[PDB]
Design a protein around this ligand. Sequence first.
Ligand SMILES: CCOc1cc(CC(=O)N[C@@H](CC(C)C)c2ccccc2N2CCCCC2)ccc1C(=O)O
Length: 671
Amino acid sequence: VRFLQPFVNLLSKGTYWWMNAFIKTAHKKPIDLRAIGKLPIAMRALTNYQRLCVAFDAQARKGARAIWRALCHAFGRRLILSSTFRILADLLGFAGPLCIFGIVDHLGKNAYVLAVLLFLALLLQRTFLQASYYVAIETGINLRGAIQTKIYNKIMHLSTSNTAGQICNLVAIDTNQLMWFFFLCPNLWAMPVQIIVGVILLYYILGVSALIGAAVIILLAPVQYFVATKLSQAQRSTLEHSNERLKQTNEMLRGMKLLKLYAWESIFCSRVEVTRRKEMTSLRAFAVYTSISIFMNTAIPIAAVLITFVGHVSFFKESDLSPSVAFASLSLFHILVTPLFLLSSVVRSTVKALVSVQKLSEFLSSPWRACTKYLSSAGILLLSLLVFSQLLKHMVLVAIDYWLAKWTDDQSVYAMVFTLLCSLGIVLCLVTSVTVEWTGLKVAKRLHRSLLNRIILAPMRFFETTPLGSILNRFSSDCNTIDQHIPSTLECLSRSTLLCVSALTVISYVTPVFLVALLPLAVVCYFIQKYFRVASRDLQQLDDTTQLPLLSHFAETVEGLTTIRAFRYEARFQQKLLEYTDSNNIASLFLTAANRWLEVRMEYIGACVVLIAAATSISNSLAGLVGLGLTYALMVSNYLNWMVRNLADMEIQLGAVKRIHALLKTEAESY
Ligand SMILES: CCOc1cc(CC(=O)N[C@@H](CC(C)C)c2ccccc2N2CCCCC2)ccc1C(=O)O
């Protein structure tokens, strides 16, 4: 047992301090199934299975509702403990904007004490938030173990009269949707509370104009939900053509010998290219919806701030905009963004796992070179336009946030220039979104065409030596990755890095002394990031590689069920399944603990940054520039952990482009 998360004092339970030792070891020598621990007794497949079966007996003494109530009876204590942590973290995160309000109101007219209390509340709030995430993940994984064991125990008893692939994917995707509903279940209860208290605080701060602002920002959640629905629709319509193109590529690759013998390769390649053109026609709509999602997500808050402040000053002829009031409202808008954006995802996952539990009831009742090659496939025109648009968009963003400070203290001219710059910002953001999506599409097209052509020209000895599985897998999974994940992830990594650099630039321009303190933290940040990455890579690979046995086992058990029951070998196979699912659970649990460790450390670095910025700016001013620095240093932590998550998410996905280009360089016959 090397997963001693339950077995430490509450502080290291809260800051995942034990993981430190592990991660340090995991940096020197690679991670093996001997280095990762064995799960505690509290979280085993047998322990959670027996807990769930006791809950099921209790519910049967008193269908889908039966399964939901049994899952409640079995995991509700920990589910509501995670929900408590999450709601306390939500309220203590709201404790930030009003504190910025108090600080800027003091110094524009008790300030240092407000700054240190902001620091303390921020530190405690981020710790509680990460602990909430962790408890939700742990109870979700325990539920996955119990449900896997239960559906396997049901596979054992079912009759020979009865769909093996259905059971295999019921273990593969339906239990997954259930576990992810349990991952996001605290959010389902704590996002409405968050949004309500946010709108209430905004109203209390800004009078009546804040309600117009909060309505405009809330108008983001339904639009995001509609966009996500259209995106899944386009996803299915793309998967159709992708499956047909895959079958055609498999035809071309099985009979490559005969084709090359009579030189029919070019005509079959042309047919595959026609199918690829149809799939690209569908991918265009998919990318349009993805671009609309990115643009709405970034542009609804800009317009919300614009309408709020302008209508507050001109239309309402309302209170004069003071720095404290304005920047408190801005911080509350930034705190309001994320719940409004992710509420659609929470609801969609909720209905998805509801369907999954209904189905389970019905069943149970019976790499820099890769980046260089990818960017070079785009061309200098699209790459230059993309980089210029990203940089100028973030410049316009910081520009409007600074014009806010200069606004606070000819008010018509200020309002007009603020409106002009917000329009410039939304146009520039739409440009950067459409450009990243167009670049993604163009690179996918070029890379796929070159790959197909370069394996058409491949010699026969190459095909005899190379496994057919790999040549098909490059077109099957990696071209899919380049088609779907690389555009969005590259765009979001660009946004995360540029927003982080922008925030540090803002709080350095407000506070010239913070720069001196930036370099230590910078170093710390770097180190942590580095170590996390290596650990997070190993674990991730391990977590994937242990899932293939499990599903495989399920498949086998469904195929040779009558033989296993004839042998009376049922207990041995249930034992093998418990061992496989325990390997998978320990892998996923250590992966999530490493994630929690990194996000806790990055949030603590963000807390130190906000404390330094608050202290030094309140000092130098003892006005609106202090509020600017305060907001940006307040939220640097999100940019930081989002950017490191996106970098980890970026390298793995870029490995696919790397190996596509690797296969692209095979020898060609001088035809
Ligand atoms: C903050 C990321 O850590 C997690 C967090 C969770 C639980 C969780 O409340 N998630 C929120 C995101 C946070 C920022 C609110 C969420 C809500 C809706 C849809 C997706 C998501 N997401 C979950 C996948 C990655 C981020 C978007 C699970 C798993 C993880 C994880 O380490 O993988």
